[PDB]
Design a binder for this molecule. Sequence first.
Ligand SMILES: Cc1cc2ccnc(N[C@@H]3CCNC[C@H]3OCC3CCS(=O)(=O)CC3)c2[nH]c1=O
Length: 130
Amino acid sequence: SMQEEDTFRELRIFLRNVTHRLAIDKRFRVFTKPVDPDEVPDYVTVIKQPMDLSSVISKIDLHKYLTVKDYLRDIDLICSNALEYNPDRDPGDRLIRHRACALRDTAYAIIKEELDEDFEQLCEEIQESR
Ligand SMILES: Cc1cc2ccnc(N[C@@H]3CCNC[C@H]3OCC3CCS(=O)(=O)CC3)c2[nH]c1=O
């Protein structure tokens, strides 16, 4: 219905705003675009589902997220990919891992403060009806 389409449009607006606020944070620059294979050639072989904030924006615009839970799965993926690919004790690896956890924590904190639980519940119930 028109009301359900209005609901998902509001969701997309909300998700674009959250994602933009993450994307403009200097700490998260490394997560804004896909990994360049010329810089990191074994990434594609090690990480089976690459995810980044530009891919998240594309997925929002392709109507791929019907709930905030589905969106947070991809944010969690950005984080888990970083922990998997950069597991070493070296400062480079430790920096990106800290940034990855910060990205995750920041996304969850924004959502905790600004997502209405009844709005998310509505999204989930519409999704479950399809
Ligand atoms: C998304 C991503 C991008 C990336 C780009 C370059 N190098 C990586 N990993 C290196 C693997 C071996 N040890 C050093 C690591 O690079 C650390 C470096 C810290 C600064 S940063 O801006 O977070 C880019 C990664 C990278 N690992 C990644 O997971």
